[PDB]
Symmetry: C4
Subunit: 406 residues, 4 copies
Amino acid sequence: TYTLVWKVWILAVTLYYAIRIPLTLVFPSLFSPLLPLDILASLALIADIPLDLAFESRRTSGRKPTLLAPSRLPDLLAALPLDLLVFALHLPSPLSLLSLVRLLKLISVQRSATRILSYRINPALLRLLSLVGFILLAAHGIACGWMSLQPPSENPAGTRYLSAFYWTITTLTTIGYGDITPSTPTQTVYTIVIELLGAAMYGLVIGNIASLVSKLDAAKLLHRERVERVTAFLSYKRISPELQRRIIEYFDYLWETRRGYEEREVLKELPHPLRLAVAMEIHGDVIEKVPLFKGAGEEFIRDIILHLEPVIYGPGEYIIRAGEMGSDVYFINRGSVEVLSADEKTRYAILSEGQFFGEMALILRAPRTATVRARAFCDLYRLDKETFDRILSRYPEIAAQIQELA
Amino acid sequence: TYTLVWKVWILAVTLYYAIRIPLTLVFPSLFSPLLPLDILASLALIADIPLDLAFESRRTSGRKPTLLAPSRLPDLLAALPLDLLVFALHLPSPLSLLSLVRLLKLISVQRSATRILSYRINPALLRLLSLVGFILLAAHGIACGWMSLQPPSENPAGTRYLSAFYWTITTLTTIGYGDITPSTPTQTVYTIVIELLGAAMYGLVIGNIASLVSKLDAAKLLHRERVERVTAFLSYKRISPELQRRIIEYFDYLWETRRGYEEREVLKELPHPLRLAVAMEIHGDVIEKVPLFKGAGEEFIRDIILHLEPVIYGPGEYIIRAGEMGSDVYFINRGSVEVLSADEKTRYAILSEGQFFGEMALILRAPRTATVRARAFCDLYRLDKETFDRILSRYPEIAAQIQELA
Amino acid sequence: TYTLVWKVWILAVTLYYAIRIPLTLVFPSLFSPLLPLDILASLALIADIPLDLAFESRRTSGRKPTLLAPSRLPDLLAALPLDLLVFALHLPSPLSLLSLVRLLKLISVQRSATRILSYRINPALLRLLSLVGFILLAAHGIACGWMSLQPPSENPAGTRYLSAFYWTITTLTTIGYGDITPSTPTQTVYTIVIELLGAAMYGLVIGNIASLVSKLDAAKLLHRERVERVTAFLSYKRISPELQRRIIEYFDYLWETRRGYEEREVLKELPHPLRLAVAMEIHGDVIEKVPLFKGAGEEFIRDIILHLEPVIYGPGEYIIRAGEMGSDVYFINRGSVEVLSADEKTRYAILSEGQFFGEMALILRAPRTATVRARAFCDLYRLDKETFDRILSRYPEIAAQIQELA
Amino acid sequence: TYTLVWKVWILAVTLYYAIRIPLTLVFPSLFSPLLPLDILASLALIADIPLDLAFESRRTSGRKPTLLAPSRLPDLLAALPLDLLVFALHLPSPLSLLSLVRLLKLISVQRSATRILSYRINPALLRLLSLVGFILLAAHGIACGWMSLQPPSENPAGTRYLSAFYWTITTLTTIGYGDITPSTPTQTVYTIVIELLGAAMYGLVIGNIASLVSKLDAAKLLHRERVERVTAFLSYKRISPELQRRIIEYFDYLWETRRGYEEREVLKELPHPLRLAVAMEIHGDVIEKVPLFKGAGEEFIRDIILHLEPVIYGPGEYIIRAGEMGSDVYFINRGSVEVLSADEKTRYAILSEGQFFGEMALILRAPRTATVRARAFCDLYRLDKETFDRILSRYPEIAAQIQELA
Ligand SMILES: Nc1ncnc2c1ncn2[C@@H]1O[C@@H]2COP(=O)(O)O[C@H]2[C@H]1O
Ligand SMILES: Nc1ncnc2c1ncn2[C@@H]1O[C@@H]2COP(=O)(O)O[C@H]2[C@H]1O
């Protein structure tokens, strides 16, 4: 949308004001040669007042003020051509400061950037970058103020501005070389207030950096503290080192795969329709592929899919042991698994991605026919007999169908 | 209440003490011309001791001490007219410091402001502002102490105080120009202790700023990390980009509407009566408007309303598909929805705010008569058949009424 | 226990070492006059090695090393009388530094203080205070090192130590006056390493302060953000201002009473026996006072009490409305409540702390006889009919007793 | 694996580049005598480009780019021998800076260390250490840049490098002695940009330190705030000091044993197979030791074990009181317990680690035969009658067996 390039243009005009206004306050001779752009800067800026008023009124509706409220005032009062008149008639120093009203546009530009950005940019990083930009603009303004109090001299404007910017950076960053310092009480008061301002600005920078880096690896720290808690509890319970190693490597696999997030908790953030869509896409072509499920309507399938629960079986450990009272069908979703004889002397089968096993427990209460043992991290899904019956009761005809299949 | 203006007056008197006491310690000639206000300052301050004792005793009751406990002592010992006597009889320097006992009122004024404010003011911002005020008062006191150690000279009191405040600000902010520095061992020791104090104060400022800005966008970061977790889990599960886009825009709608808060968790903070009131106001004139509900007493309505659960259906996705085994009535609460034929070739109806659909599943087990599909984000509420029966069992007469309606 | 005074004595001896060793390294003449205390310091310190080994071995058992492991080594190698020999034979500078091995006792004293304290002292505040103490000791040591590199001069030892401490404080606090600076390459290298160390130490101070103050009002911020979330969700749902005000004042009452903690979640931290004890003490002499409960054994009472759930009814709102299907007994626990006629034209009763109402719903399904309305914040407890029956089924004889009472 | 020593070698070569390139930029005479190692440095570095491409392609598969993407570019463009050619033909200053392209290897070495480490090293501490290393390398580079702008002089290269490093450390650490400062506009601009960079670097150091120490005792603070909440809620409920003391010591035991972690929540992080393994190892040889359990298959045992719930009975408080309606078997797991007569006048038994009691309630509804009272913190497990029946229903034959045992 072309509103973005307009916002960028308004940002450039605001930066032009922030640079020029204090720079031409100390250098009146700089006013007239840049007068065309100022007109270009002014006609644009006032034009932004109603135009942007449209772009914000047409979202979320509810009418918008144009002469009221704490909001929309910093733009309104910054629209006035106070700078043009005050420079044109050469108003004296203590009243020429009214030219700074253009700088009030900054606190509206920051709000605009808070929604032009902050989709693709971290909000803490966005706040830090806005603070850095404001600090640089303030450093320019403070250098101009420092120049305004220096005794007049024949030094080139460039070198005196460089000295003023050197001093203001030295102060704002609290480095404080002190090679150039106030020589007069007014410079002393200005330096005191600038020292307070610089301490506040550097504290803001440090606080924003800490806020950023304190959450820079939130997932990693959340997983690590979870592992630490689990390991400490196991060590208290005097669990053998081998089982702790198996748990450690399970957590390592879980982190390397899905960054430590619990599978069941992630599919709890989503609403029911989105959970249904996600589950139907995860379990696509693996649930209608079941023989005892085939032929049932998709309202049965969608009810079945929402109740499958994830379970990460580790490598080499048992999922099913023959002769037990098996009561849970399974569906493989990332790993592979081996079906072995009751004595594990021979391998019946190898199953992989999109395959399933344990169907018999759905149709019959018979004990398990064979052992099932994970080769890799199986990363599969489970469905209990009792839940299957509960969700089957609402579909009597397919219950009779599966009873006939038995 | 007039107690607020009294507290503000006591704050002003305490600031007057904090300004004058160290300033007149180095300038004895300043004592006598301000003596009237000191009397005004003193008669007020002692008067605050019992008076405020009332205002705190009449809340939470339980009696209050007046010569005991760590609390209420900083006010008591600060009530004493030590400053008046010590200035009146010109006690020498090492014992004149007892005039500072007025400054103990600050740690009671801060406690008072912690409850006069902190309703309408962020507690972290309140602590930061109190720290800044205390730092400025301490800067004044430290400038006075620095003046007290300077060799006597004919410089105007104003310019020497300005130099002392310049030095103390330069030190407390760790900028350290070093253009003015200790010339004598006593000034060196004072500068060492003031350097430690200033480092501690600036560390406190930075820590408070970090604590503030680390929670300045808690809701935004909590929503963003939730979105990141969901997206990472989806990407691990190899979900298609279009479904991820639909989930992303659902989360965007949820944030723009209710700032990322889960609807069910917010109505869990409230107690049962407040949950009932909030639910009755959300679902007002949308639940008695139901035909199969009309005529039932309000104890049935209030039982029904507490069990409605929220579900945000996304735009263009199905809520009801014809021919299924529908078992859930619905109530629209923000969006709009279209009722379409079983082949979606023609639109039966458009429903909006305060409308409902799916009534049939309450009265009959018949399959759905038509499809229902969200136009916008529907943002609606659902009620299951089984929950409806469970809460209906306690009202047999209206169960018979609805059975007759069928 | 006398072990505390022994630990305090060992702390004092360690501080004596930390002060004297670098101070006498630059001042050899200070060694001999303090030799007695050094013997006193040494005979004690070695004596601490086995003695404390007992005090830690007799807790948690499991045997302890005495010549092994990363732990217990800093104490062992600090026990050696390296300082006494190195000062007695006047070993030259580059090898005299071995006297510093006494300072290794600090990292054991800190560990000891981490368990002598940290019961009654905040762990973050304890870490900050230990850091401050270590920083002051390091400042003394660094001042001694700075003196060691200064060209020899006839200045008094006191004033040169004061200048060195001034410089080291100026550097460690990053203030950096620069009135005294390296004059030689070795002093330059020492200043570089001390600048790195001071930057690290001041960063540690700031980080510890931020960690402390970022959790200084955890309860207040946790309650405030909960209130903000609730209010934002209500405002999205367009709830009337009066209901929002009632919710705001409910949250204010909850904070002022129990600091924002959910009553049900606090009695979830405790184990079953402690939950039972706490509940029996909360509901003492209010549950046997019930007429339809009197005479039952205390195994019935203790089963009843664990199932009472808390509910804070706000002032002026209804708890019971006459003619409804009441199914929940109530017990008042902080507030008061008024029993009013079905038309609220006359007050039947006022009930307060330790009183109860709604008994009839336990014995009979009859509709409520009268309205019950909170005067204050009632802050009471509730018991459902269905839960009462479920916990009654295990006591058939008292069920028959209450059936006879009906 | 030998890949680790190769990564360490590549790290050493990258550090060699970071040290030499800016050092030989200001000292051309240093180029030729180190030319052999440069060849050794270069032939290795290019060799790393495909070789490491293998080591990362053989994990997680999916093919890898070699001329594309933001990743793998900093290594590619750093492989080029720009330094060798630019030094060999003595390209002038403003274009000789292209030799710095070797330094782009740093942002790949950091990524490599992020996975060579971060298993055994805290990620926040790892980030802090990487930042410190980068800051030291940048300090060397900035010292070289400062030397590049100094007017030429006959001072030894060592002492001028020492002065430059002194200045850059003084600036980056914000200490700012100001004994050496820019004398020319170009040095002023360089100092301004270096002041900004140093402020940013020191803010990064402080932020990383705060992020580290704000989570340095997460478990301790999480337990302490839980204790504070519990104690505040108890004090609001006016619970007696003795019960609060018992709760305080229960929490102290819980912290000293398992660091404040809830037993039930830790065995919720693990998946079902790992939960089963951990439970089977915790309850090994204590569940088959039961007489009414012996003889049942291990599918019954494994179903029983998953349902045992932990409960920490405090010292001296009752677990079982005679004559009640006992309905829960128990298993001791850390502590000891005393079985006492119904009048507690005589002790029937003392049971300890691995023992059990309360078996009768499983087989019969008879009231408890004797009292059971904890000596120490019992730290045991419980199993309800109703849960036992629910998990028994799936094994009818052993239900008949236990019915015969009765
Ligand atoms: N003509 C219509 N106008 C409005 N709503 C309709 C119309 N026809 C069907 N519906 C609704 O569409 C719903 C879909 O089938 P249900 O049985 O769920 O209940 C149906 C009605 O509530
Ligand atoms: N005169 C009274 N004095 C005290 N309590 C009363 C009186 N009349 C009614 N109640 C209580 O008011 C309650 C409201 O009806 P319930 O059936 O819930 O049980 C009723 C009694 O507990």
